[PDB]
Amino acid sequence: ETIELKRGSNSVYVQYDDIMFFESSTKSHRLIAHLDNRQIEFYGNLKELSQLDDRFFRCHNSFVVNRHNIESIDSKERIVYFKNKEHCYASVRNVKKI
Template sequence: MLEIFICEDDQQQKERITNYIKNYIMIEQLDMRVALSTDNPDEIMDYLQSNQVNGLYFLDVDLKHEKSGIVLGAEIRKYDARGSIVFVTTHSELTYLTFLYKVEALDYIIKDDFTDLQQRVIDCIVTANERLLSDSGEMKKRFQIKSGDKVISEDYENILFFETSSKLHKIIMHTDSRQVEFYGKLKEVEEIDSRFYRCHNSFVVNIENISGIDKKTREITMVNGEVCYSSSRYLKGLYKAWEKN
């Protein structure tokens, strides 16, 4: 999921940008959300320090704060190295500071009467989403499914396990941050990648995200503390595959 952050000290401008983003996400039914819309850069840094984020950031350069938008961008890079940063400013002459602070920017939006702010914001969302889905040209594998009217995309490495749903022909995908229900079969899921191991009639687990296996209770504890189960039939093979991993 792409998380979007707005840091703008002009209340009217902040609300305008936030509404543009929320409306576009809703209309296009994109797998993203506005995580924070604030005038305080410290709130964004507190969030990044507590969460693993794929982010798009709209930052006012001239914040009424001891920390400028450029400095905030440099700090964001320490926690979200591949995040997309957009600077929104009335001071086009300050853009050179991004080079001094080594902040690669996706775009600079100049706040003036001639800027189509809404379209520029939308263009940035589209580009950031494309970057995320292509993983900046890297070969990181992603699991893509249709859930309702949305197409959900998730890195394989973030998936903990899949389980059958109480709803007919549906599966629930558990990740470190969410659960997504979709139509599918566990047999199809286990064949997608070698890290997905069938451990039970109702579960397929990502062996790379197992933190422990209790052979007596057949409980599988994931890296985030969630628990799923193995049947006795699959336990030996699961344990062997996990130890080898």
């Protein structure tokens, strides 16, 4: 369950469940892997990442979440909470499918 996060000159290798979620941001050309203790930018695409494993799920245009690290979901406000206290958002379309 190892994923290579290509950073540029170097890669970081982490386990699937080290990842809370992946984020696309308009402020970077790189995606952001939200790990338990820090964020790491890397080159990738959300669609491909969602296909690596059933636990990964595209819940928003900007986010692919790791279901194994979800603590709770507020379906009304569409907020997804992770074990490390980070959150992301879910679209109306996908919130109930997470």
